[PDB]
Write an enzyme that holds these catalytic residues in place. Structure first.
Site, PDB file in Angstrom:
ATOM      1  CB  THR A  77      -1.017   0.089   1.274  1.00 19.55           C
ATOM      2  OG1 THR A  77      -1.750  -1.194   1.195  1.00 19.55           O
ATOM      3  CG2 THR A  77      -1.533   1.284   1.524  1.00 19.55           C
TER       4      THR A  77
ATOM      5  CG  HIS B 267      -4.897  -8.757   2.399  1.00 23.20           C
ATOM      6  ND1 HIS B 267      -4.351  -9.355   3.668  1.00 23.20           N
ATOM      7  CD2 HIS B 267      -4.257  -7.498   2.550  1.00 23.20           C
ATOM      8  CE1 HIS B 267      -3.513  -8.303   4.197  1.00 23.20           C
ATOM      9  NE2 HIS B 267      -3.478  -7.131   3.606  1.00 23.20           N
TER      10      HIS B 267
ATOM     11  CG  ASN C  53      -0.509  -8.006   7.171  1.00 20.77           C
ATOM     12  OD1 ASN C  53       0.029  -8.984   7.520  1.00 20.77           O
ATOM     13  ND2 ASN C  53      -0.258  -7.754   5.920  1.00 20.77           N
TER      14      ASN C  53
ATOM     15  CE1 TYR D 258      -4.274  -4.782   6.876  1.00 21.64           C
ATOM     16  CE2 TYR D 258      -5.961  -3.164   6.856  1.00 21.64           C
ATOM     17  CZ  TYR D 258      -4.618  -3.544   7.028  1.00 21.64           C
ATOM     18  OH  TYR D 258      -3.708  -2.667   6.965  1.00 21.64           O
TER      19      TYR D 258
ATOM     20  CG  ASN E 175      -5.065  -3.399  11.305  1.00 28.36           C
ATOM     21  OD1 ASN E 175      -4.819  -2.155  11.492  1.00 28.36           O
ATOM     22  ND2 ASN E 175      -5.025  -3.717  10.035  1.00 28.36           N
TER      23      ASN E 175
HETATM   24  C1  LIG Z   1       4.374   0.523   3.245  1.00 23.84           C
HETATM   25  C2  LIG Z   1       3.947  -0.748   3.161  1.00 23.84           C
HETATM   26  C3  LIG Z   1       2.569  -0.999   2.571  1.00 23.84           C
HETATM   27  C4  LIG Z   1       2.133  -2.361   2.749  1.00 23.84           C
HETATM   28  N1  LIG Z   1       0.995  -2.718   2.297  1.00 23.84           N
HETATM   29  C5  LIG Z   1       0.517  -4.025   2.227  1.00 23.84           C
HETATM   30  C6  LIG Z   1      -0.710  -4.596   1.545  1.00 23.84           C
HETATM   31  O1  LIG Z   1      -1.398  -3.676   0.903  1.00 23.84           O
HETATM   32  N2  LIG Z   1      -0.992  -5.799   1.901  1.00 23.84           N
HETATM   33  C7  LIG Z   1      -0.210  -6.649   2.657  1.00 23.84           C
HETATM   34  O2  LIG Z   1      -0.794  -7.904   2.703  1.00 23.84           O
HETATM   35  N3  LIG Z   1       0.872  -6.264   3.184  1.00 23.84           N
HETATM   36  C8  LIG Z   1       1.243  -5.100   3.239  1.00 23.84           C
HETATM   37  N4  LIG Z   1       2.506  -4.931   3.785  1.00 23.84           N
HETATM   38  C9  LIG Z   1       3.293  -5.726   4.431  1.00 23.84           C
HETATM   39  C10 LIG Z   1       4.411  -6.276   3.272  1.00 23.84           C
HETATM   40  O3  LIG Z   1       3.880  -6.777   2.043  1.00 23.84           O
HETATM   41  C11 LIG Z   1       5.407  -7.097   4.016  1.00 23.84           C
HETATM   42  O4  LIG Z   1       4.756  -8.421   4.365  1.00 23.84           O
HETATM   43  C12 LIG Z   1       6.076  -6.542   5.081  1.00 23.84           C
HETATM   44  O5  LIG Z   1       6.383  -5.220   4.623  1.00 23.84           O
HETATM   45  C13 LIG Z   1       7.159  -7.298   5.756  1.00 23.84           C
HETATM   46  O6  LIG Z   1       8.231  -7.586   4.574  1.00 23.84           O
HETATM   47  P1  LIG Z   1       9.676  -6.465   4.508  1.00 23.84           P
HETATM   48  O7  LIG Z   1      10.208  -6.717   5.763  1.00 23.84           O
HETATM   49  O8  LIG Z   1      10.316  -7.153   3.168  1.00 23.84           O
HETATM   50  O9  LIG Z   1       8.939  -5.230   4.291  1.00 23.84           O
HETATM   51  C14 LIG Z   1       2.848  -3.412   3.457  1.00 23.84           C
HETATM   52  C15 LIG Z   1       4.113  -3.078   4.392  1.00 23.84           C
HETATM   53  C16 LIG Z   1       4.595  -1.695   3.796  1.00 23.84           C
HETATM   54  C17 LIG Z   1       5.974  -1.436   4.916  1.00 23.84           C
HETATM   55  C1  LIG Z   2       2.092  -1.245   6.458  1.00 25.46           C
HETATM   56  C2  LIG Z   2       1.013  -2.033   6.788  1.00 25.46           C
HETATM   57  C3  LIG Z   2       1.014  -2.191   8.271  1.00 25.46           C
HETATM   58  C4  LIG Z   2       0.273  -2.468   5.742  1.00 25.46           C
HETATM   59  C5  LIG Z   2      -0.717  -1.560   5.354  1.00 25.46           C
HETATM   60  C6  LIG Z   2      -1.970  -1.807   4.398  1.00 25.46           C
HETATM   61  C7  LIG Z   2      -2.097  -3.212   4.399  1.00 25.46           C
HETATM   62  C8  LIG Z   2      -3.221  -3.588   3.302  1.00 25.46           C
HETATM   63  C9  LIG Z   2      -1.369  -4.253   5.058  1.00 25.46           C
HETATM   64  O1  LIG Z   2      -1.832  -5.324   4.611  1.00 25.46           O
HETATM   65  C10 LIG Z   2      -0.257  -3.651   6.088  1.00 25.46           C
END
Ligand SMILES: Cc1cc2nc3c(=O)[nH]c(=O)nc-3n(C[C@H](O)[C@H](O)[C@H](O)COP(=O)(O)O)c2cc1C
Ligand SMILES: C=C(C)[C@@H]1CC=C(C)C(=O)C1
Ligand SMILES: [Cl-]
Ligand SMILES: [Mg+2]
Ligand SMILES: [Mg+2]
Ligand code: NA
Ligand code: NA
Length: 398
Positions: free
Chosen positions: A37, A191, A194, A196, A251
């Site tokens: 996101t 999804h 996390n 949701y 969450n």
């Molecule tokens: C800015 C941001 C936005 C994210 N948006 C989503 C999302 O839209 N859907 C989701 O399932 N996880 C989302 N995550 C979780 C990531 O997909 C990922 O699982 C998490 O950042 C851990 O991996 P990393 O250490 O490589 O960042 C988001 C994480 C971050 C930091």
């Molecule tokens: C940085 C996060 C906690 C993400 C923000 C938006 C979505 C849809 C996630 O799954 C976690």
């Protein structure tokens, strides 16, 4: 700048750089862009950013044969509640998504749309403004005090879904999946992680229901599995994956403090394997690691050491994508990818490194990310992070 203190490792000699088929897609390496996101969609209408989103995804598709999972995309207005996250329900949205998918495909990469429904993580005031409910599994447990109070002030108290309303969400998941495929996506990711809406059903903290959608492991999993089944029927198992975060606390999910949490997720994995053995194997299961129980915390923080996702592999026999603090830990990735059906999602460092895959192969320094622009309405911190070559030219090797 490059991340200071990081000692890169070339991973070209590992399975991270062996091809693998996921759904219909022949990936050329196993570094996956997990859903991220970014909040560049424009209001009104939750429209993917008309100025920058194509470029953002194009940049990150640059390594041929990369699997990209999109930022979470709302399946309907009722599923949403953030004005700057995109949807996949309207013609105006799909016009932009089509351009994004085309661009990714021109770079010989692949794109899977993450289908998002917020539940209690939504902003109740945005929903009230738009005449929408503030939804969750239950009506007597809340994400936090601020959300509960926002909902009350908005005259939009948290609402426990009826069965009919659950069915309506399922209809919307189906149509969103259809829209995604019709616009050219390679598949969708459900999804269910996390914290949701689907996760709010899975988790016994947030799900206090006493009907068929709560009160037991099977019942808490019912909504997630109904969505799985509906999408498998609509667009095919080869175009559907599922994301789970067994140990997540983001969450207000339970994580490992809930002694029944592994059983809950084991049940889901088992049900997926049952479907697989019966001829309908999902393209993948995507797991968030206990390495990151909250992705808002800096790498190394919020690590849960009391549990492993390894149990899933005893149950589900298909591809598994694992994400969470892997960019800074090539030594861990080197071990995990020895398993021949494991892929690695790199989130935050794909934000800051559009050429991350090259950097992983070759053991190059990584661009430091800028958390402040993770969610900003800007090209800055979105499409202006340099490739390694561009970073050298900027003097970052110094
Ligand atoms: C800015 C941001 C936005 C994210 N948006 C989503 C999302 O839209 N859907 C989701 O399932 N996880 C989302 N995550 C979780 C990531 O997909 C990922 O699982 C998490 O950042 C851990 O991996 P990393 O250490 O490589 O960042 C988001 C994480 C971050 C930091
Ligand atoms: C940085 C996060 C906690 C993400 C923000 C938006 C979505 C849809 C996630 O799954 C976690
Ligand atoms: Cl908002
Ligand atoms: Mg009520
Ligand atoms: Mg700044
Ligand atoms: Na920078
Ligand atoms: Na611009």
């Amino acid at each position: 700048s490059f991340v200071k203190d990081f000692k890169p490792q070339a991973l070209g000699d590992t399975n991270l750089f062996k091809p693998i088929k996921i759904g219909n897609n022949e990936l050329l390496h196993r570094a996956v862009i997990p859903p991220l996101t970014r909040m560049r969609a424009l209001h009104p209408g939750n429209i993917p950013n008309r100025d920058w989103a194509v470029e953002y995804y194009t940049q990150r598709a640059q390594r041929p044969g990369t699997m990209i999972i999109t930022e979470g995309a709302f399946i309907s207005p009722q599923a949403g509640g953030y004005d700057n996250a995109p949807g996949v329900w309207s013609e105006e949205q799909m016009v932009e998504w089509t351009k994004i998918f085309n661009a990714i495909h021109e770079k010989k990469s692949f794109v899977w749309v993450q289908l998002l429904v917020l539940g209690w993580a939504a902003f109740p005031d945005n929903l009230a403004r738009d005449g929408l409910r503030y939804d969750s599994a239950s009506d007597n447990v809340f994400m936090d005090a601020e959300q509960e109070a926002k909902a009350k002030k908005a005259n939009n108290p948290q609402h426990s879904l009826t069965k009919d309303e659950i069915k309506q969400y399922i209809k919307e998941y189906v149509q969103a999946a259809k829209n995604s495929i019709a616009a050219g996506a390679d598949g969708v990711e459900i999804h269910s992680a996390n914290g949701y809406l689907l996760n709010q059903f899975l988790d016994p903290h947030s799900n206090t229901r006493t009907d068929e959608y709560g009160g037991s492991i099977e019942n808490r999993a019912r909504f997630t599995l109904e969505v799985v089944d509906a999408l498998v029927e609509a667009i095919g198992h080869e175009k559907v994956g599922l994301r789970l975060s067994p140990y997540g606390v983001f969450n207000s999910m339970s994580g490992g403090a809930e002694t029944g949490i592994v059983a809950q997720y084991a049940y889901v994995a088992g049900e997926l394997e049952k479907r697989a053995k019966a001829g309908k194997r999902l393209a993948f299961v995507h797991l968030v690691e206990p390495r990151v129980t909250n992705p808002f915390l800096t790498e190394g923080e919020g690590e849960y050491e009391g549990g492993s996702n390894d149990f899933v592999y005893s149950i589900w026999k298909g591809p598994v994508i694992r994400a969470g603090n892997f960019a800074l830990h090539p030594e861990v990735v080197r071990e995990e990818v020895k398993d021949k059906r494991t892929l690695i999602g790199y989130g935050r460092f794909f934000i800051s490194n559009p050429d991350l895959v090259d950097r992983l192969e070759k053991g190059l320094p990584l661009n430091k990310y800028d958390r402040d622009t993770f969610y900003q309405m800007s090209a800055h911190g979105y499409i202006d992070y340099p490739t390694y070559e561009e970073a050298l030219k900027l003097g970052w090797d110094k």
